[PDB]
Amino acid sequence: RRLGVMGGTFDPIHYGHLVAASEVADLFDLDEVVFVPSGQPQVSAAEHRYLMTVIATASNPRFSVSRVDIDRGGPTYTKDTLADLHALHPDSELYFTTGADALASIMSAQGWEELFELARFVGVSRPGYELRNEHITSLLGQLAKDALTLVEIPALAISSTDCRQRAEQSRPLWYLMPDGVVQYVSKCRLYC
Amino acid sequence: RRLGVMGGTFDPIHYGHLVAASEVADLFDLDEVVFVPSGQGRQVSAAEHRYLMTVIATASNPRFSVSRVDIDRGGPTYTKDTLADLHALHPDSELYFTTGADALASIMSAQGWEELFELARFVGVSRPGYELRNEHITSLLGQLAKDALTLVEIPALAISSTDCRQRAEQSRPLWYLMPDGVVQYVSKCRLYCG
């Protein structure tokens, strides 16, 4: 039984995140994808980010949201995320998924060997990421061997950064994310 | 009332189309965007299929609607016909024709574009880094330096109809690339070889 773990800030979550989750679940025949909003940060309150993710993933039986990073403590380390989730899901083979840029930083930290005993890794990026970052890709691939995969997601052209700025400038967020998330951003006035 | 006109094949329609329509409606304070599937590529889905997908996808939005003027008129679609018909249906309205930047280039590069500008204003939408042909770049540039045409960039148009079709052919998920209703419609009707 294979379990996907998508680690992100989700500030806000959008269709790029959701497409990426579906793609990864299909490419590796995952039975479920657990969305884990990170604790550590500026960044919206963890509850806002948690609720937005609950709203966006609710209607999908194969998506779920975990509070392991939010509840644990100050700074979020992927080794912690995987440790907690390994305990909750000892059955499951973990496929940790996040931005290719974040993954580069995560693998470059102390105890990266500890990471490979806990999970397989999937870096996601918007199109043409290997051209702009040919060395990060080259180093990631070579360190992890076939314990890591980089996949390109056209929909990740949608970014949390653009979403936030559209909200700041009162430009519509329709069809970039579920209406529920759009309204949540509005109702809580998340980005001024 | 300022009326948006989204001309496309919509085979299939997706969030890229919908984001672009939303953006253009906001940029030009449009009161409504009318989606017009073209009449009728190796094969293109039947017009009714493309119409229903567009109806499904735009339904929940009070400011979107779908027209059959191109579908019903005849075989091949001319924008001048589309603009003629919709002006008759909305004589009050100032028409804002919106389509793919590549398509807009072609429309402008064919005889009688001068005939078009009296009927509507034009908006080309494109995905970032979109590699147009050269005769299209030249055609857009000329109109751009005269400020007779507007181009807006839509990150969400990185989602394309071609990739959706291929994902459907290869039984790869279309979730969150388009509304579930359109996802299911493609499936239920087996639109791209299942």
Side-chain angles (χ1 to χ4, degrees):
Chain A
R1 187 264 187 104
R2 287 99 95 198
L3 191 64
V5 177
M6 193 155 203
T9 303
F10 307 119
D11 192 21
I13 187 172
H14 52 68
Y15 280 142
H17 295 104
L18 300 169
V19 169
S22 294
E23 179 77 316
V24 169
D26 171 77
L27 291 182
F28 299 96
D29 188 9
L30 308 181
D31 300 289
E32 174 181 353
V33 178
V34 186
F35 284 70
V36 189
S38 79
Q40 127 179 337
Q42 68 173 268
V43 172
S44 300
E47 288 309 316
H48 286 325
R49 294 183 289 107
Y50 174 73
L51 287 186
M52 279 188 301
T53 308
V54 171
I55 289 170
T57 61
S59 64
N60 192 331
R62 287 191 185 173
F63 291 167
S64 60
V65 192
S66 180
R67 303 184 50 100
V68 288
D69 286 349
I70 293 172
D71 287 345
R72 176 182 317 108
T76 299
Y77 298 110
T78 303
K79 63 185 175 182
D80 298 330
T81 302
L82 295 180
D84 293 353
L85 292 178
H86 178 53
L88 295 172
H89 306 70
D91 281 346
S92 285
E93 184 182 8
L94 297 186
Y95 286 72
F96 188 80
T97 308
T98 190
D101 260 27
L103 193 50
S105 181
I106 290 170
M107 293 291 180
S108 76
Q110 60 178 15
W112 59 272
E113 301 201 6
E114 305 308 323
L115 293 170
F116 285 105
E117 295 180 347
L118 282 183
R120 293 176 185 272
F121 294 84
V122 180
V124 289
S125 62
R126 76 182 72 199
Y129 180 73
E130 294 184 1
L131 299 143
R132 297 184 295 275
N133 298 271
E134 187 175 351
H135 285 95
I136 288 149
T137 290
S138 182
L139 293 171
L140 276 174
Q142 124 155 44
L143 172 74
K145 300 299 182 289
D146 57 334
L148 179 158
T149 313
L150 294 181
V151 316
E152 181 185 18
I153 312 292
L156 279 180
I158 302 165
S159 76
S160 295
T161 302
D162 285 338
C163 287
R164 271 179 256 121
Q165 285 171 329
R166 291 182 74 82
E168 289 181 48
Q169 304 163 24
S170 299
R171 306 183 47 198
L173 289 170
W174 304 121
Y175 305 109
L176 294 170
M177 58 179 65
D179 276 24
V181 186
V182 177
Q183 294 293 350
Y184 187 90
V185 173
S186 181
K187 289 178 214 202
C188 294
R189 298 198 287 157
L190 285 188
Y191 318 112
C192 301
Chain B
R1 47 207 76 193
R2 293 163 94 178
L3 192 63
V5 178
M6 269 273 295
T9 303
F10 308 118
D11 192 22
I13 189 171
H14 52 68
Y15 280 140
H17 296 104
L18 299 168
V19 168
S22 294
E23 178 77 316
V24 168
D26 172 77
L27 290 182
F28 298 98
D29 187 66
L30 307 181
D31 299 290
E32 173 181 352
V33 178
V34 184
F35 286 70
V36 188
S38 81
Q40 271 178 337
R42 188 290 181 190
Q43 82 173 336
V44 170
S45 299
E48 287 309 317
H49 285 325
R50 294 183 289 109
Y51 174 74
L52 287 185
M53 279 188 301
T54 308
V55 169
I56 290 170
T58 61
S60 64
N61 194 332
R63 286 205 178 179
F64 291 170
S65 61
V66 194
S67 180
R68 304 184 50 98
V69 288
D70 287 350
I71 294 172
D72 286 345
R73 176 183 317 108
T77 301
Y78 297 111
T79 304
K80 61 187 175 183
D81 299 331
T82 303
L83 294 180
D85 293 352
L86 292 179
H87 253 326
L89 295 172
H90 305 71
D92 282 346
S93 284
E94 183 182 8
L95 296 187
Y96 285 72
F97 186 81
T98 307
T99 189
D102 57 334
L104 192 49
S106 298
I107 291 170
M108 294 293 180
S109 77
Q111 196 171 354
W113 56 85
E114 332 95 7
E115 307 308 324
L116 293 170
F117 284 82
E118 295 181 347
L119 283 183
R121 289 178 181 274
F122 294 84
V123 180
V125 294
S126 61
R127 74 180 132 269
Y130 180 72
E131 294 183 1
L132 300 140
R133 296 190 293 273
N134 296 341
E135 184 175 351
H136 284 172
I137 291 150
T138 58
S139 183
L140 292 170
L141 275 173
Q143 304 297 342
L144 264 186
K146 299 178 186 282
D147 283 279
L149 178 157
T150 314
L151 293 182
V152 317
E153 183 182 289
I154 311 293
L157 278 180
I159 303 165
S160 75
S161 296
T162 302
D163 287 338
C164 287
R165 272 181 257 122
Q166 285 171 329
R167 291 181 74 83
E169 288 180 48
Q170 305 162 25
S171 299
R172 308 234 308 286
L174 290 171
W175 304 123
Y176 306 110
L177 294 169
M178 59 181 66
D180 276 26
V182 186
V183 176
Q184 293 292 349
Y185 186 90
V186 174
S187 180
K188 288 178 213 202
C189 294
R190 298 189 285 157
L191 284 188
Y192 316 115
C193 301

